[PDB]
Design a protein around this ligand. Structure first.
Ligand SMILES: CCCCCCCCCCOc1ccc[n+](CC(P(=O)(O)O)P(=O)(O)O)c1
Ligand SMILES: CCCCCCCCCCOc1ccc[n+](CC(P(=O)(O)O)P(=O)(O)O)c1
Ligand SMILES: C=C(C)CCOP(=O)(O)OP(=O)(O)O
Ligand SMILES: [Mg+2]
Ligand SMILES: [Mg+2]
Ligand SMILES: [Mg+2]
Ligand SMILES: [Mg+2]
Lengths: 299, 298
């Protein structure tokens, strides 16, 4: 009867129930308790005009990738909070959270084959998906390397921006490239690239500016953020050796101490003027769009 | 206007990625490489893929397998892998997670180097997508049972389905790709499933028996084949104290050798879970070694 049971098992597809599906989803469902990623999709479809069926799936794909990457990013950044709530790995544990997020990457991958049945086009959608997830990992990998090997390598603004094109551009380009390929209707990748860059620097700027006015978690993480990259390279360039070292020392403290975090912010405001330099950099990037009268980037 | 020219050129180019950056983030992966091909070769005696293709099927499987191990070691808190320190303890959990995941997608990339045939590619990618979804499901269950014990005490049946997913995942992936690429009998899938099952129960068994004679599965808290049998056997025979002591030890996440040895001797003399397992393994191997009407074997 034992041999019968095995015979049966090995001849069937692996058993997986609905209840099992729920167990594995808990870490992902928790972050869902968190519509502007979709506002941009909706808006771009005015150009692309994908039928609502196809569009919804693109939206589901983007949602799984976005959410999953955030679940793993918080494990990678040791973040206690996300969207004001406790992060999933602190509730379900790092193990289940890593596994559930990765599981969702593959669920997203599965949705990609339900956008089309056209074999040339299907290949294309997969290549896009594959190429941008590879790019998201390269950027994430470099962002983490610099942070965990600090002070071995201090990136420059250029190195930083190439990291951003990969890390933050990945999902923006993946979304748009999928829509342009599905479109039955100039490419907007340059503009989505510009948008993702503005997006990452704003995220890095706001993380510091909300605290000065915000937990300033980036400091606790030791992150080579945009204002930090500028402050470090500014002090190196002006010989401000002790400030250079003081910034490194605070980054390396992986501190949650309110006071010390404040000391580093005051270094960036009074000494290097990095926060004002970032606010300005952003504005410039936006102006590029606000003053695109020929519509070279804009549709 | 020079910065704008710089920004303009940036956004109009593919993202920049140097071979240097490629090495810096390959560290956790390069490390586990310092420590399969045979099963792929024997199986090919039947599928006859040309050597150019077989080598790619092989790089794919290596990438997926080593990546699975990197992640597995983080999820299981393993200090050792193949006699050496685990990558996460050297480079940190963050880099190891990201690199391991990076390699899953590199492996996916390679799939398109297997054929130009659009219909076939679509099937290769589906097989790849299905078995990785399966691996994750299995791993999900193994990890949930362990980390929330005793919310769920799995039965032998549940363990086996978890294994069909978890371990059968890569075995089936390897085999389904080959069957799909073959230029030349019945599917060898059931055989490959039985092999994944023997491989896992054997792994669980050897982890304890080699210590009895570091029993890291005890430290980890894994609902291993021997442990599932003991937990169910104890409840069934009404050995309340033993059932609870097994759980208590598992929940300690202990590295105390005497404590691990106590658990092992409990499965040895009190529940006869070790003998049950050894014999279950023998029976399974017997299913193949006595397959005279080649219902499993080719
Ligand atoms: C048009 C599609 C929009 C999709 C939703 C927005 C996608 C933003 C993608 C950002 O990608 C990453 C990559 C790596 C890490 N993160 C998380 C950041 P945070 O914790 O500050 O929110 P990070 O830790 O990189 O600062 C995000
Ligand atoms: C033709 C196939 C070539 C590859 C064969 C791979 C065989 C082993 C597959 C095991 O798959 C998994 C899945 C999940 C976790 N593990 C790691 C095991 P261990 O740490 O004991 O080595 P597990 O943690 O599941 O006991 C392994
Ligand atoms: C993780 C980064 C860098 C931004 C992702 O999008 P947003 O952070 O702005 O939106 P939600 O996290 O609230 O989904
Ligand atoms: Mg983060
Ligand atoms: Mg991050
Ligand atoms: Mg393990
Ligand atoms: Mg495991």
């Amino acid at each position: 009867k034992m041999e019968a049971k095995i015979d049966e098992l090995i001849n069937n597809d692996p058993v997986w129930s609905s209840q099992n599906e729920s167990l594995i989803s808990k870490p992902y469902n928790h972050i869902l308790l968190k519509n502007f990623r979709l506002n941009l999709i909706v808006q771009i479809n005015r150009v692309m005009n994908l039928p609502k069926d196809q569009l919804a799936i693109v939206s589901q794909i983007v949602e799984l990738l976005h959410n999953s990457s955030l679940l793993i990013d918080d494990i990678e950044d040791n973040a206690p909070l996300r969207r004001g709530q406790t992060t999933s790995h602190l509730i379900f544990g790092v193990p289940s959270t890593i596994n559930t997020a990765n599981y969702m990457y593959f669920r997203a991958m599965q949705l990609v084959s339900q956008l089309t049945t056209k074999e040339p086009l299907y290949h294309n959608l997969i290549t896009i998906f594959n190429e941008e997830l590879i790019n998201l990992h390269r950027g994430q990998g470099l962002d983490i390397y610099w942070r965990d090997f600090l002070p071995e390598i201090i990136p420059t603004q250029e190195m930083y921006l190439n990291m951003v094109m990969n890390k933050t551009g990945g999902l923006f380009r993946l979304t748009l490239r999928l829509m342009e390929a599905l479109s039955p209707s100039h490419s907007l990748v340059p503009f989505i690239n510009l948008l993702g860059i503005i997006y990452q620097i704003r995220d890095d700027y706001l993380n510091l500016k909300d605290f000065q006015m915000g937990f300033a978690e980036d400091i606790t993480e030791g992150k080579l953020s945009f204002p930090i990259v500028h402050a470090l390279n500014f002090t190196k360039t002006k010989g401000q050796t002790e400030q250079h070292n003081e910034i490194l020392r605070i980054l390396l403290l992986r501190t949650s101490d309110k006071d010390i975090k404040l000391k580093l912010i005051q270094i960036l405001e009074f000494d290097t003027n990095s926060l004002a330099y970032t606010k300005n950099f952003i504005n410039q990037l936006v102006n590029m769009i606000k003053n695109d009268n020929e519509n070279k980037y804009l549709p």
